[PDB]
Symmetry: C3
Subunit: 142 residues, 3 copies
């Protein structure tokens, strides 16, 4: 399969697949300063057209917190297939838990493609007729 | 395929598939108020029986933090296939990063379904026999 | 399918598939204390070789926060297929929101395996030629 990738400009550092990386690292399109308890969209400088039928998912690197002090407010980002216009540039929504700086080209998150869920009819029912599982720690911790 | 959905009551807004959303938006089942640094189960007012062999995942919308100042504490919720009882209503577990108010019907997160992982045998070994990859930023930042 | 699992030592409680659990719970390899607003890598006392072509994903349990007052800094951990060396032990990167103790053997997160994304050719293009979707809450909230 092919992903069509359009960079914001000639100064973006191209993204790349590496051997031991199952997902592909994305990079801050510019220097970004964030304060403790402050929010900021970090631009990733990339617009993409994914193969037919695929969405993309975006998560932090596991070193993102150590190196950059931020977490991703939407936890795992969902890039909709339809987000493929010439101006639909990808972003990483960041919340700083400490004062931090990010540099241009810094690998701060990673992505992969995956097939969209199938089409599914929503059948409204009065009663489900299954026994309750329960949740929220119903199985304990020990 | 079909999902059977049971709404908590007749005042819940029905969830809906939109053409530019690969995931489906879920909605607060009642008004919720949350103070900075407090936790609240935001009830989503729906219980579901998913197609056989599937689980679901629930993540925030990208605008959730902006519009509502919350994060999802479990990051990506996993709705187990067995949580298909008549009382197994879904919830979004929110930590507030600021005083916030959520209204009944507000689209605060999104879901999709996916095949469960296959049945796996867990084979204990004394030695894995492979070279170490290392981790936690072993590949650097640049 | 088979997963080869190597425990850190003979005192680790063995992990298991439970009926109502679509993912499998992972456990703390030792007692860990974390003060509010501290970070700590919680060791899970396991290394694994996954079936050929698979990665694994690691997220918290819904009850992780209720029971242990932590969130997962990288939101959803991606365990690369290559991370299968004899010293490649899994970890849960935890940030404490309140003062907590995590006890040895406690089930603090869950994992599953998944087919990696297939091989993708990155095709550099100057214009994507599609209509802009927009994002970051473009569909509103109501
Ligand atoms: O982390 C994210 C989440 C979303 N989006 C874009 C693409 C997606 O279709 C749209 C709405 O979520 O915003 C991003 O660039 N990054
Ligand atoms: O974010 C979540 C996570 C879990 N659950 C329910 C369904 C799941 O099977 C059960 C145990 O985690 O709790 C939710 O409603 N929302
Ligand atoms: O939450 C995580 C995230 C990553 N890793 C390991 C495996 C992964 O391939 C390596 C590089 O991220 O770190 C973990 O053990 N836990
Ligand atoms: Mg990496
Ligand atoms: Mg959306
Ligand atoms: Mg569970």
């Amino acid at each position: 399969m092919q992903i069509k990738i359009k960079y914001l400009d000639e100064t973006q550092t191209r993204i790349s697949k590496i051997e031991q990386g199952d997902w592909i690292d994305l990079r801050a399109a510019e220097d970004v300063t964030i304060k403790k308890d402050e929010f900021k969209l970090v631009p990733l400088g990339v617009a993409m057209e994914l193969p037919e039928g695929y969405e993309a998912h975006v998560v932090p690197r596991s070193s993102t917190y150590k190196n950059f002090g931020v977490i991703q407010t939407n936890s795992m980002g969902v890039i909709d297939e339809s987000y493929k216009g010439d101006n639909d540039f990808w972003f990483f929504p960041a919340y700083a838990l400490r004062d931090t700086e990010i540099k241009k080209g810094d690998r701060i998150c990673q992505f992969r493609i995956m097939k969209k869920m199938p089409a599914v009819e929503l059948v409204e029912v009065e009663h489900l007729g299954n026994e309750d599982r329960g949740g929220l720690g119903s199985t304990g911790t020990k």
